[PDB]
Design a protein around this ligand. Sequence first.
Ligand code: HEM
Ligand SMILES: CCCCCCC(=O)N1CCC[C@H]1C(=O)N[C@@H](Cc1ccccc1)C(=O)O
Length: 454
Amino acid sequence: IKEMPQPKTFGELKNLPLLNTDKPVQALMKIADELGEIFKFEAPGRVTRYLSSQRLIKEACDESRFDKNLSQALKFVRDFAGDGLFTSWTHEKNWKKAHNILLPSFSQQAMKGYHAMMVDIAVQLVQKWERLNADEHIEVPEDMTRLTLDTIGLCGFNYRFNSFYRDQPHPFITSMVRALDEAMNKLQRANPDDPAYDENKRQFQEDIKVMNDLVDKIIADRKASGEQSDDLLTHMLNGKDPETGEPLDDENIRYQIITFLIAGHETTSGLLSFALYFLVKNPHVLQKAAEEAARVLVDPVPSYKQVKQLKYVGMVLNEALRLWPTAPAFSLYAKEDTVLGGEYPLEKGDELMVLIPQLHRDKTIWGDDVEEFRPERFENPSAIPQHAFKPFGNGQRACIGQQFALHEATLVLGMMLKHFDFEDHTNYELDIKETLTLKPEGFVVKAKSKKIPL
Ligand code: HEM
Ligand SMILES: CCCCCCC(=O)N1CCC[C@H]1C(=O)N[C@@H](Cc1ccccc1)C(=O)O
């Protein structure tokens, strides 16, 4: 048994001021590069251990020994996402109940039903870029977020945010982004009771009110209708849990919709943004992915079956997820006293944080070239060891949206590569903005149309 290292301390504040930065995940990555596969992080009244090696992460991903923890970040998001799937404990009745009801709606099979709605929004993105003037550029994360929000609104509850018709976000989105900003900011606060934070806390309560009032209104309007579209809202209003035999109540449905809207906005848009960044920085890879898009997507409207054929586009997406997993951390707690890695004794209730970007840089798994963008790493899926690659988290608490996000991302990236050539006209310097998720801030390109009809 060894003592684990710990980064620099600030007297009574222990390690907390290390998070007083707009880029805390990148700060922890640098600390993991300095200290290795595990380090202790202490705040007043809180300890956790940050894991970076596949060797220790594979044990942490043992569901007999560790369960999902709500990190302080997730506890703050729980104030508006409630006992939705993402911010519920595994042992809350509503976790398993929602999981059983929603799993069939998120299966690879269910994507056949969502495809047409995804195509509707993808075509709006292509038409936006087709309509830019010669002197204009693309704001990549801004347009990817317009797309992913609209896709989940239309597949989520047959609601059009119409993001490609606006500069100013939909009211719900203003409240949701500001609520997320508050929850991630609260984490850092030396002194949270400080009066400088009074306006933030008043605002926070106001935004919770906006999100609930508006989602409850869609639920209530849909019950009034009788209308039965093929969206998640229908499946949740009709579905019964086979275990309890109960449907979700309206309050929990509202938490599920807020939860799905957070995911659309934050994660899939990050992935598409990083994928396009790595493609314009790696022209040989861009050529191989655009060859596939041009050969496979032979119809003006892509089919489900054609999107499944974009294998190299899927490898590009996996390699962007390896370098910059847009949901970069998840938290676990010890179910019982146990010994991590033959060396680090833990007590029942002790917390671990999985630092996914660091896991994805483990040279003992990936080789010496870990900073290089090389989608060929993913040629043969079965060559990647268990728990080496975890952009969608772990086990029964893994991302329920994984098939949805990768279907949307492959469809959209395929269409972008078919329809346009891309220039890195500013020689963009990567600047990663941290919200709930990671996105490349200020990433812009120019698209030269290949003039292929829709
Ligand atoms: C590239 C896109 C996405 C990534 C990288 C991603 C990543 C993740 C990760 C790492 C987790 C586990 C979090 C934890 O253990 O605390 C998770 C959970 C979840 N994600 Fe995603 N996600 C993505 C897209 C989506 C989408 C599109 C949806 C739904 C519309 C979604 C819904 C969820 C839900 C509901 C959970 C909670 C599942 C449960 O515990 O039962 N995600 N996601
Ligand atoms: C599904 C993606 C959601 C990611 C949530 C944000 C997150 O995990 N963050 C954002 C900041 C860095 C990292 C983290 O280590 N979070 C810890 C930070 C921490 C706070 C207080 C004490 C110790 C650690 C936590 O939220 O618990």
